[PDB]
Amino acid sequence: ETPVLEKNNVTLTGGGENVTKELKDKFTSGDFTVVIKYNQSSEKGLQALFGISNSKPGQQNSYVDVFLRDNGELGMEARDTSSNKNNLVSRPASVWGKYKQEAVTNTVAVVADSVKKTYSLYANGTKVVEKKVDNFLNIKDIKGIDYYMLGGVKRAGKTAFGFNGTLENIKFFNSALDEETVKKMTTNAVTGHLIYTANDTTGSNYFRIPVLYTFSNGRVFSSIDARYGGTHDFLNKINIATSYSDDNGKTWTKPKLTLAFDDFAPVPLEWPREVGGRDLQISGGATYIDSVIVEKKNKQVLMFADVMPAGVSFREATRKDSGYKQIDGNYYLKLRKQGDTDYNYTIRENGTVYDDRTNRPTEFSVDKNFGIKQNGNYLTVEQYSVSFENNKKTEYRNGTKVHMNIFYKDALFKVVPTNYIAYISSNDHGESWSAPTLLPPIMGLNRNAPYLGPGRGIIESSTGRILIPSYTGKESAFIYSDDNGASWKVKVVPLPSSWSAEAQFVELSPGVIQAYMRTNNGKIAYLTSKDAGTTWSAPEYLKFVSNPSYGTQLSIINYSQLIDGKKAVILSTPNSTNGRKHGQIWIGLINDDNTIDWRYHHDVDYSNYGYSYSTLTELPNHEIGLMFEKFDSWSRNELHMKNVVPYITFKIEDLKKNL
Ligand SMILES: CC(=O)N[C@@H]1[C@@H](O)[C@@H](F)[C@](F)(C(=O)O)O[C@H]1[C@H](O)[C@H](O)CO
Ligand SMILES: *[C@]1(C(=O)O)O[C@@H]([C@H](O)[C@H](O)CO)[C@H](NC(C)=O)[C@@H](O)[C@H]1F
């Protein structure tokens, strides 16, 4: 399969290039594939990589193009004036703009297939959308096509949608190339910045909530939400997936599922993106969500995550019950047997299920992975699969038998429908992990657990206290251990309003820590402790970030090397009142009085490109690793997109910009 036209190194500044003689009437069947390796010199405006049109007066709605917007959206149009058919197919956040002050080379493609009546778009190895349209047009369907151009669309004798940049290579084919070919053709250096990808070894099409941490031995470790039924928080199925690098982030292991339930199979699902359809959710599998990592002094690694029973929504679930009882001064996880109204059972020593009415052991037990046994034998339930037949969502028992689990909707004994926190530990730096441990009811018996602030925890240097950031919706909850993580306590700090106070900590000097957090007022807040987290100041606010009221998670870390002779912190956050966009990395230098001089910043891409949750780590070579949601993860227009959580790196010199 060879192109009808191939051109190289065409640099343009808005004016385009006529290629009518080299394309006229070459699209014999009418189908097409166009593969464009380009970089933009300017992102501003609506720009067409190529345009095939009727250029005559009155025929300005007769064209085909592939376009780029200043927010990284890749799209195509196919329109015919006389039939009044107007097709637009696109996906937000498909391309990259700039990286470290240089234009990024992307490779994109469009495929139009008349037999299928589909338009497909590809960006950097990913098929970002394929859509079947009733009013499909191929090139032969559009009347009086007379003008074929690079970097523009000729409409009524004028160049519209002028491209600014270089078309490094452009190929036009007069047929619909197959998906695997086009994926391969669009694969490039950008593709290699995805650690997690759609339908990799996680089975998930979607990801959110990345976390990076560098261990004491030099291994760089990542965790992330693998979200199977679109990118919805709830209801969904979510697992925590992990991947690591032992060469300073150059190469990563194939992702593994590290915290996962198996009530629902971890399968690749094509979640709909249309208005209305995109609100679809599954009925809900048991869920792990929002991971937090810390390495202990002794090199053991902890990972925490929120746990939600299957079908339980974070909005509706009960705030007035911890899911525990206190009996003889011990905290036991309580259970309700199917058919009962009361919670008459507790999981006690060795996982034995007791009847609290009689205070005697039953035939039932629960193992350390929440699985239920009767007389020493596992009870089972049948796993669910989700599918699209057609195009309706179906959930069904799929023939796989899995252990019955107290978090499942089909369990004979069930936990309270509320949120919990679990942690697991590793003694080999992330290669293998213990069974989970649910946090005891540190908020009290009559309150739900807190929600974790995704990112890392810290070890405060003077006391060795371990601190894990969390929040309740009205308070900060700083979870801590003073015995190297054997037992856990909490400091609960009331907040000025109902902030989703996802926080991260830094240590300014021994005993002095600051908690940086999301608010509901548009600003980033920070609270200060001068006694290793025992007491906290009133909030203060960064002066230079102005976001929407809903806010976004942030990442802030200590950096080990001096910058301008000073101890430094590094912050990552969006900064825009218009959405989750305009990602910035800020360098803060610690002054002698423990205030911070926010001296430098670097915009991660152009300001209208998407930037939501993020995570920073210092690499062992003292470069900075960043993984982030390169899209607006709040927007209802950017839900359920594949391959949008990249990893990139910076040298400090890349970041020391602007002042
Ligand atoms: C890709 C896109 O958004 N194309 C639309 C057309 O589908 C149509 F809506 C039109 F009106 C037009 O020019 O024909 O406007 C443009 C465009 O919004 C504008 O030119 C603003 O640059
Ligand atoms: C972030 C998000 O806003 O994008 O929100 C968290 C909470 O929903 C937050 O309270 C909303 O303000 C999500 N976590 C949970 C537990 O819902 C994050 O995963 C993320 F979705």
XYZ file of C-alpha atoms and ligand atoms in Angstrom:
702
model
C 0.000 0.000 0.000
C 1.656 3.189 -1.304
C 0.621 6.852 -1.064
C -0.858 8.781 -3.978
C 1.146 11.686 -2.598
C 3.975 12.035 -0.084
C 5.626 15.381 0.807
C 8.440 16.208 3.243
C 9.540 19.202 5.297
C 6.904 21.716 4.266
C 7.268 24.744 6.532
C 4.261 27.069 6.595
C 3.232 30.289 8.278
C -0.555 30.488 7.575
C -0.476 30.683 3.770
C -0.634 26.963 2.889
C 0.562 25.211 -0.284
C -1.514 24.228 -3.302
C -1.124 20.555 -4.225
C -4.139 20.348 -6.563
C -2.091 19.043 -9.552
C -0.588 16.245 -7.391
C -3.951 15.101 -5.901
C -6.700 15.931 -8.431
C -9.118 13.004 -8.956
C -6.666 10.530 -7.389
C -9.204 9.485 -4.746
C -10.844 6.995 -7.026
C -13.011 5.054 -4.542
C -13.517 8.175 -2.460
C -12.020 6.618 0.716
C -8.924 8.168 2.197
C -6.163 7.908 4.785
C -3.940 10.902 5.488
C -0.971 10.541 7.869
C 0.659 13.784 8.992
C 3.888 14.086 10.994
C 4.017 17.737 12.037
C 5.003 20.282 14.632
C 3.291 23.658 15.240
C 5.248 26.928 15.395
C 2.119 28.496 16.933
C -0.914 26.794 18.522
C -3.287 29.814 18.228
C -6.425 29.546 16.153
C -8.187 26.735 14.354
C -5.601 25.160 12.024
C -6.004 22.636 9.207
C -3.193 20.223 8.388
C -4.707 19.808 4.907
C -7.924 20.716 3.081
C -9.702 19.178 0.118
C -12.469 21.444 -1.104
C -14.718 22.998 -3.610
C -13.088 26.470 -3.642
C -15.754 28.154 -5.820
C -18.107 30.983 -4.635
C -21.007 29.632 -2.531
C -19.339 26.222 -1.943
C -17.575 27.133 1.311
C -19.299 24.217 3.152
C -17.893 21.612 0.764
C -14.661 20.297 2.257
C -12.695 17.693 4.148
C -9.978 18.588 6.607
C -8.155 17.480 9.706
C -7.801 20.242 12.276
C -6.009 21.189 15.469
C -7.194 23.564 18.204
C -5.191 25.514 20.793
C -6.270 23.074 23.545
C -4.842 19.982 21.848
C -8.107 18.754 20.292
C -7.689 16.794 17.049
C -10.665 16.695 14.730
C -11.871 16.316 11.177
C -14.646 17.821 9.143
C -16.375 16.400 6.081
C -19.087 18.618 4.679
C -21.148 18.958 1.486
C -23.021 22.169 0.717
C -25.901 20.961 -1.522
C -26.825 17.845 0.554
C -26.388 19.896 3.796
C -24.379 17.065 5.410
C -21.923 18.289 8.010
C -19.799 15.724 9.799
C -17.446 16.668 12.604
C -15.540 13.931 14.436
C -12.936 14.704 17.127
C -11.519 14.071 20.584
C -10.133 16.587 23.068
C -6.541 16.301 24.338
C -5.235 14.236 21.410
C -1.960 16.048 20.658
C 0.946 17.764 22.422
C 1.888 21.431 21.843
C 5.290 22.159 23.307
C 7.684 20.447 25.700
C 10.601 22.253 27.354
C 10.178 25.385 25.175
C 10.278 23.337 21.873
C 7.429 22.437 19.558
C 6.484 18.755 19.834
C 6.463 16.494 16.741
C 3.113 14.648 16.591
C 1.938 12.122 14.040
C -1.776 12.123 13.399
C -4.071 10.452 10.880
C -7.577 10.273 9.496
C -9.203 7.244 7.908
C -12.549 7.468 6.059
C -14.122 4.059 5.309
C -17.257 4.125 3.113
C -18.193 0.486 3.649
C -18.204 1.012 7.460
C -19.399 4.652 7.169
C -16.782 5.532 9.846
C -14.254 8.295 10.326
C -11.286 7.400 12.531
C -8.658 9.710 14.047
C -5.233 8.728 15.329
C -2.643 10.615 17.403
C 0.776 9.331 18.414
C -0.078 5.621 18.215
C -3.550 5.921 19.685
C -6.863 5.683 17.822
C -8.423 8.588 19.676
C -11.871 8.161 18.081
C -13.748 6.077 15.527
C -17.311 7.159 14.821
C -19.962 5.814 12.429
C -22.114 8.607 10.954
C -25.448 8.347 9.107
C -24.544 11.267 6.806
C -21.078 9.884 5.940
C -19.276 11.631 3.074
C -16.257 10.336 1.184
C -14.346 12.588 -1.255
C -16.500 11.521 -4.208
C -19.693 12.383 -2.243
C -18.742 16.089 -1.987
C -19.716 17.916 -5.189
C -17.191 19.848 -7.282
C -14.033 19.293 -5.243
C -11.417 21.346 -7.143
C -8.715 22.348 -4.609
C -6.362 20.228 -2.542
C -4.036 22.009 -0.138
C -1.482 21.612 2.617
C -1.944 23.680 5.740
C -5.314 25.228 4.949
C -8.742 24.821 3.343
C -9.577 26.873 0.243
C -13.095 28.300 0.752
C -14.529 30.793 -1.784
C -11.029 31.625 -3.065
C -9.529 32.378 0.438
C -7.279 30.248 2.621
C -9.145 29.283 5.802
C -7.732 27.664 8.960
C -4.096 28.473 8.127
C -1.536 26.075 9.639
C 1.527 27.480 11.396
C 4.372 24.971 11.584
C 6.182 22.285 9.625
C 4.629 19.263 7.936
C 7.625 16.989 8.409
C 5.977 14.203 6.398
C 2.477 13.943 4.928
C 1.093 10.920 3.094
C -2.237 10.713 1.268
C -3.655 7.281 0.448
C -6.759 6.628 -1.668
C -8.012 3.812 0.572
C -8.920 3.185 4.177
C -5.770 1.729 5.859
C -6.352 -0.864 8.668
C -6.213 0.153 12.322
C -2.967 -1.686 13.209
C -1.125 -0.167 10.268
C -2.195 3.350 11.142
C -1.402 2.859 14.881
C 2.096 1.790 13.889
C 2.472 4.641 11.389
C 1.549 7.227 14.055
C 3.792 5.750 16.777
C 6.627 8.133 17.694
C 8.627 9.576 20.655
C 5.381 10.832 22.268
C 3.974 7.281 22.464
C 6.874 6.293 24.750
C 5.736 8.748 27.482
C 2.727 6.556 28.340
C 3.465 4.171 31.189
C -0.137 2.957 31.377
C -1.975 2.370 28.079
C -5.424 1.270 27.029
C -5.863 -2.475 27.271
C -2.319 -3.108 28.511
C -1.645 -5.689 31.257
C -4.209 -3.949 33.472
C -7.034 -4.694 31.049
C -8.264 -1.112 31.478
C -9.011 1.334 28.705
C -8.775 4.302 31.096
C -6.627 5.696 33.861
C -6.630 8.555 36.328
C -4.888 9.657 39.574
C -1.175 8.987 38.949
C 1.374 8.799 41.791
C 5.186 8.824 41.559
C 7.623 7.955 44.327
C 11.374 7.418 44.318
C 12.615 4.764 46.775
C 15.875 4.944 48.758
C 17.478 2.307 46.504
C 16.929 4.396 43.290
C 13.835 2.591 41.976
C 11.202 4.967 40.593
C 7.722 3.637 41.346
C 4.269 4.562 39.986
C 0.724 3.794 40.971
C -2.509 4.846 39.290
C -6.305 4.296 39.190
C -7.189 1.804 36.443
C -10.807 2.904 35.784
C -12.622 0.354 33.674
C -16.119 1.803 32.961
C -14.928 5.150 31.741
C -13.166 7.682 33.950
C -16.101 8.085 36.335
C -15.168 8.279 40.074
C -18.336 6.328 40.804
C -20.109 4.120 40.031
C -17.321 2.189 38.379
C -14.791 -0.541 38.809
C -11.375 0.798 39.807
C -8.148 -1.077 40.631
C -4.788 0.374 41.664
C -2.195 -0.569 39.035
C 1.574 -0.164 39.467
C 4.713 0.025 37.312
C 8.344 0.796 38.124
C 11.656 1.815 36.626
C 15.177 0.897 37.663
C 16.896 3.186 35.104
C 15.800 6.683 36.228
C 12.450 6.513 34.404
C 13.715 5.576 30.942
C 11.969 2.146 30.934
C 9.047 0.831 32.963
C 7.718 -2.606 33.864
C 4.508 -3.912 32.325
C 1.803 -2.726 34.687
C 0.475 -5.094 37.369
C -2.844 -4.965 39.257
C -1.796 -4.380 42.840
C -5.072 -3.529 44.623
C -7.916 -5.195 42.778
C -11.207 -6.900 43.479
C -12.485 -9.641 41.179
C -16.291 -9.337 41.487
C -16.107 -7.737 38.001
C -13.578 -8.773 35.379
C -10.925 -6.125 34.557
C -11.837 -5.722 30.892
C -11.437 -3.115 28.138
C -14.718 -1.277 27.620
C -15.657 1.240 24.919
C -17.373 3.835 27.088
C -19.650 6.195 25.137
C -18.625 9.847 24.813
C -21.861 11.332 23.386
C -23.968 13.768 25.397
C -26.216 11.746 27.726
C -24.487 8.397 26.940
C -21.311 9.580 28.714
C -23.222 9.746 32.006
C -23.703 5.951 31.826
C -22.095 4.021 34.621
C -21.961 0.361 35.498
C -23.910 -0.897 38.491
C -20.596 -0.765 40.424
C -17.850 -3.271 41.342
C -15.944 -3.166 44.613
C -13.429 -0.396 44.206
C -10.014 0.796 45.236
C -9.402 4.468 44.475
C -6.971 7.332 45.177
C -3.560 5.833 46.103
C -0.912 7.178 48.504
C 2.691 5.912 48.821
C 5.406 6.279 51.438
C 8.702 4.496 52.193
C 9.398 3.881 55.899
C 12.782 4.460 57.612
C 13.407 0.700 57.471
C 12.802 0.646 53.629
C 9.393 -1.058 53.853
C 6.967 0.573 51.387
C 3.344 1.337 52.292
C 0.545 1.922 49.826
C -2.849 3.214 51.002
C -6.062 3.483 49.019
C -9.738 4.189 49.615
C -11.966 1.074 49.555
C -15.617 1.246 48.457
C -18.017 -1.729 48.491
C -19.591 -2.642 45.139
C -22.421 -0.357 44.097
C -21.831 2.224 46.846
C -21.531 5.808 45.691
C -19.336 8.247 47.497
C -22.107 10.876 47.320
C -24.899 8.795 48.880
C -22.963 6.576 51.347
C -23.347 6.892 55.019
C -21.348 9.418 57.041
C -22.708 8.185 60.412
C -21.264 4.636 60.555
C -17.618 3.520 60.559
C -18.434 -0.107 59.794
C -16.958 -1.147 63.155
C -18.221 -2.179 66.581
C -16.344 -1.922 69.887
C -16.522 -5.100 72.000
C -14.397 -5.568 75.141
C -12.400 -2.488 74.106
C -11.481 -3.917 70.670
C -12.524 -2.597 67.259
C -14.076 -5.284 65.040
C -15.329 -4.869 61.490
C -19.064 -5.569 61.572
C -21.186 -7.609 59.141
C -24.834 -7.940 58.161
C -26.050 -11.345 57.097
C -28.348 -11.284 54.044
C -31.964 -11.215 55.235
C -31.089 -9.440 58.533
C -31.806 -5.763 59.170
C -29.237 -5.377 61.968
C -25.496 -5.930 61.841
C -25.370 -8.973 64.134
C -21.846 -10.198 63.358
C -18.203 -9.208 63.799
C -14.926 -10.418 62.339
C -12.782 -11.222 65.379
C -9.498 -13.061 66.091
C -8.151 -15.177 63.148
C -10.957 -13.819 60.963
C -13.602 -15.845 62.839
C -17.110 -14.419 62.323
C -18.914 -14.104 65.664
C -22.609 -13.731 66.327
C -22.675 -10.699 68.626
C -26.119 -11.663 70.002
C -24.707 -14.931 71.419
C -21.034 -13.911 71.549
C -20.019 -17.264 69.998
C -18.037 -18.139 66.869
C -20.081 -19.143 63.788
C -19.211 -21.570 60.993
C -17.969 -18.572 58.968
C -14.568 -16.885 58.678
C -13.020 -14.082 56.607
C -9.421 -14.374 55.345
C -6.926 -11.480 55.108
C -8.064 -10.624 51.518
C -11.716 -10.285 52.633
C -12.823 -13.701 51.321
C -15.503 -15.697 53.131
C -15.153 -19.329 54.218
C -17.725 -21.671 55.742
C -16.309 -24.579 57.780
C -12.870 -23.810 56.339
C -14.044 -23.893 52.682
C -14.372 -20.849 50.433
C -17.819 -19.695 49.420
C -17.899 -18.501 45.828
C -19.923 -16.129 43.697
C -20.000 -15.648 39.992
C -18.024 -12.796 38.457
C -19.686 -10.098 36.285
C -18.609 -8.944 32.887
C -19.720 -5.745 31.224
C -20.227 -5.468 27.480
C -21.882 -3.379 24.679
C -24.559 -5.430 22.886
C -25.535 -3.218 20.965
C -25.007 -0.283 21.610
C -26.625 -0.958 24.911
C -24.659 -1.713 28.114
C -25.115 -5.262 29.453
C -23.840 -6.678 32.737
C -23.910 -10.420 33.213
C -22.578 -13.371 35.156
C -19.684 -14.551 32.997
C -19.023 -18.160 34.122
C -15.965 -17.394 36.309
C -16.256 -18.430 40.000
C -14.381 -16.162 42.432
C -14.238 -16.115 46.217
C -17.185 -14.542 47.946
C -15.951 -11.263 49.453
C -17.498 -9.021 52.144
C -17.187 -6.031 49.772
C -19.296 -7.670 47.024
C -23.014 -7.181 46.293
C -23.502 -10.964 46.153
C -21.989 -11.646 49.570
C -23.783 -13.595 52.286
C -22.136 -11.254 54.824
C -21.649 -7.610 53.961
C -19.852 -4.617 55.383
C -21.520 -1.279 55.997
C -22.005 0.590 52.670
C -19.441 3.307 53.415
C -15.855 4.116 52.483
C -12.780 2.634 54.166
C -9.014 2.969 53.894
C -6.752 0.005 53.324
C -2.993 -0.298 53.264
C -0.542 -2.899 52.074
C 3.196 -3.251 52.650
C 6.151 -4.391 50.545
C 9.603 -5.522 51.673
C 11.095 -5.755 48.174
C 10.323 -2.260 46.925
C 7.082 -2.975 45.084
C 7.682 -6.402 43.586
C 5.345 -8.190 46.020
C 2.866 -6.970 48.651
C 1.216 -8.107 51.887
C -2.484 -8.715 52.348
C -4.441 -5.475 52.993
C -5.204 -3.988 56.400
C -8.261 -1.781 56.865
C -7.580 1.234 59.025
C -9.356 1.042 62.399
C -12.132 3.606 62.984
C -9.810 6.525 63.836
C -12.549 9.101 63.110
C -14.750 7.441 65.755
C -17.348 4.658 65.627
C -20.087 6.917 64.279
C -18.178 8.496 61.375
C -17.015 7.179 58.044
C -13.307 6.926 57.271
C -11.544 9.847 55.656
C -10.744 10.131 51.963
C -7.040 10.026 51.057
C -5.232 12.931 49.353
C -3.616 11.178 46.428
C 0.155 11.464 46.222
C 2.710 10.598 48.836
C 3.025 10.576 52.573
C 6.130 11.757 54.446
C 8.415 10.853 57.369
C 9.060 13.990 59.436
C 12.779 14.089 60.167
C 13.037 15.173 63.849
C 10.482 12.695 65.316
C 10.261 9.989 62.611
C 6.476 10.435 62.602
C 4.740 9.058 59.497
C 2.076 11.391 58.053
C -0.650 10.446 55.548
C -2.827 13.231 54.106
C -6.591 12.835 54.046
C -9.842 14.823 54.304
C -13.506 14.484 55.258
C -15.221 17.162 53.153
C -15.341 19.700 56.038
C -11.989 18.947 57.810
C -8.400 18.011 57.145
C -7.493 14.621 58.580
C -3.791 14.127 59.088
C -3.284 10.449 59.697
C -0.106 9.570 61.498
C 1.908 6.912 63.282
C 4.486 7.448 66.030
C 5.560 3.791 66.144
C 6.876 3.196 62.611
C 3.385 2.353 61.267
C 2.375 -0.271 63.816
C -0.643 1.836 64.876
C -2.399 4.923 63.470
C -3.896 8.105 64.870
C -5.365 11.251 63.358
C -5.399 15.004 63.836
C -8.696 16.476 62.639
C -8.558 20.160 61.730
C -11.804 22.036 60.954
C -11.662 24.066 57.711
C -13.232 27.450 56.742
C -15.572 25.695 54.289
C -16.393 22.326 52.760
C -13.079 21.894 50.865
C -12.183 18.684 49.068
C -8.927 19.086 50.937
C -6.610 16.748 49.077
C -3.264 17.617 50.586
C 0.463 16.976 50.328
C 3.160 17.817 52.877
C 6.608 19.381 52.823
C 9.131 19.815 55.622
C 10.663 23.315 55.811
C 13.006 22.613 58.696
C 13.059 19.955 61.471
C 9.646 19.830 63.183
C 8.105 22.324 60.757
C 5.776 21.029 58.099
C 3.229 22.569 55.759
C 0.144 20.931 54.288
C -0.736 22.270 50.820
C -4.314 21.615 49.721
C -7.197 21.985 47.322
C -10.020 24.264 48.451
C -13.454 25.259 47.193
C -12.570 28.988 46.912
C -10.277 29.063 43.840
C -6.956 29.201 45.749
C -4.398 26.717 47.042
C -4.274 26.761 50.866
C -1.380 25.844 53.130
C -1.478 25.149 56.891
C 1.621 25.162 59.065
C 2.743 22.951 61.960
C 5.739 23.738 64.126
C 5.451 20.543 66.257
C 5.659 17.808 63.570
C 1.923 17.853 62.862
C 0.451 17.916 66.374
C -1.001 21.462 66.003
C -1.810 23.456 62.887
C -2.081 27.147 62.010
C -4.989 28.862 60.324
C -4.917 28.649 56.533
C -2.774 30.834 54.295
C -3.133 30.931 50.511
C -0.810 31.026 47.529
C -1.097 34.430 45.845
C -0.239 33.298 42.321
C -2.723 30.427 41.618
C -6.333 31.220 40.675
C -8.478 28.220 39.805
C -12.203 27.463 39.585
C -14.174 26.869 42.787
C -14.137 23.068 42.406
C -10.309 23.029 42.502
C -7.852 20.282 41.564
C -5.440 18.010 43.429
C -1.810 19.152 43.476
C 1.592 17.713 43.999
C 4.345 19.282 46.060
C 7.636 17.707 47.108
C 10.907 18.535 48.856
C 13.910 18.637 46.526
C 17.255 17.379 47.839
C 19.652 19.834 46.074
C 20.149 23.552 46.723
C 18.728 26.042 44.234
C 20.191 29.553 44.341
C 21.841 28.468 47.622
C 18.490 27.553 49.209
C 16.410 24.511 50.118
C 13.661 24.084 47.556
C 10.138 22.718 47.164
C 8.612 21.869 43.788
C 4.898 22.329 43.136
C 2.697 21.048 40.247
C -0.858 22.336 39.660
C -3.208 23.690 36.994
C -3.575 27.481 37.064
C -6.604 28.827 35.214
C -10.059 30.054 36.133
C -11.424 28.524 32.886
C -10.939 24.788 33.642
C -8.276 22.244 34.501
C -5.585 23.690 32.224
C -2.436 25.815 32.150
C -0.317 23.353 34.104
C 2.654 24.852 35.890
C 5.625 23.695 37.864
C 6.718 26.198 40.512
C 9.998 26.291 42.386
C 9.768 27.615 45.943
C 12.873 28.539 47.923
C 12.746 28.277 51.683
C 13.747 31.502 53.410
C 15.543 31.662 56.713
C 12.187 32.510 58.439
C 10.455 29.483 56.857
C 8.409 31.580 54.380
C 8.764 30.484 50.739
C 10.047 32.574 47.823
C 8.134 31.360 44.781
C 10.837 32.455 42.368
C 10.468 30.350 39.205
C 7.775 28.672 37.177
C 7.527 26.724 33.925
C 4.332 26.185 31.916
C 4.116 22.452 31.105
C 2.444 22.977 27.680
C 0.484 25.864 26.130
C -1.977 27.473 28.510
C -5.195 26.104 27.006
C -3.969 22.497 27.044
C -5.464 20.280 29.725
C -3.810 19.597 33.083
C -5.649 18.026 36.014
C -4.286 15.710 38.766
C -0.498 15.357 38.894
C 2.454 13.870 40.756
C 6.096 14.879 41.186
C 9.122 12.915 42.270
C 12.851 13.623 42.421
C 14.665 11.098 40.263
C 17.913 9.592 41.635
C 19.953 11.759 39.204
C 18.149 14.861 40.688
C 16.021 15.444 37.640
C 12.271 15.759 38.189
C 9.774 13.154 37.122
C 6.191 14.245 36.398
C 3.098 12.215 35.607
C -0.139 14.021 35.045
C -3.648 13.970 33.600
C -3.100 15.710 30.248
C -6.771 16.611 29.923
C -9.491 18.325 31.919
C -10.677 15.495 34.193
C -13.544 17.653 35.605
C -15.115 18.681 32.277
C -18.079 16.632 31.067
C -16.633 17.014 27.521
C -13.366 15.184 28.300
C -14.612 12.000 29.998
C -13.610 8.494 28.992
C -10.514 9.262 26.845
C -7.697 6.800 26.158
C -3.991 7.369 26.760
C -3.987 10.773 28.367
C -1.772 10.309 31.463
C 1.849 10.770 30.340
C 5.152 10.800 32.191
C 7.787 13.449 31.407
C 11.012 14.659 32.963
C 12.713 17.929 33.642
C 16.179 19.028 34.616
C 16.093 21.853 37.157
C 17.444 24.183 34.430
C 14.298 23.405 32.383
C 12.255 24.611 35.372
C 14.261 27.718 36.454
C 12.284 30.112 34.251
C 10.292 33.332 34.681
C 11.795 35.928 37.144
C -13.714 22.773 13.249
C -14.808 23.790 13.442
O -15.131 24.123 14.571
N -15.398 24.262 12.334
C -16.535 25.173 12.321
C -17.502 24.737 11.225
O -18.017 23.425 11.516
C -18.652 25.730 11.127
F -19.367 25.668 12.301
C -18.174 27.171 10.913
F -19.202 27.978 11.062
C -17.602 27.441 9.539
O -16.577 28.151 9.435
O -18.172 26.969 8.533
O -17.215 27.496 11.916
C -16.089 26.624 12.067
C -15.266 27.241 13.191
O -16.012 27.061 14.387
C -15.021 28.736 12.994
O -14.502 28.932 11.672
C -14.075 29.316 14.047
O -12.719 29.199 13.605
C -10.866 14.147 42.075
C -11.377 15.077 41.013
O -11.958 16.134 41.363
O -11.157 14.821 39.812
O -11.932 14.214 43.024
C -11.902 13.330 44.143
C -13.130 13.613 44.997
O -14.304 13.208 44.281
C -13.247 15.074 45.427
O -13.804 15.128 46.742
C -14.152 15.904 44.523
O -14.034 17.270 44.916
C -11.849 11.884 43.638
N -11.846 10.954 44.744
C -12.932 10.367 45.241
C -12.721 9.442 46.402
O -14.040 10.587 44.800
C -10.601 11.742 42.777
O -10.390 10.389 42.374
C -10.732 12.685 41.580
F -11.804 12.304 40.801
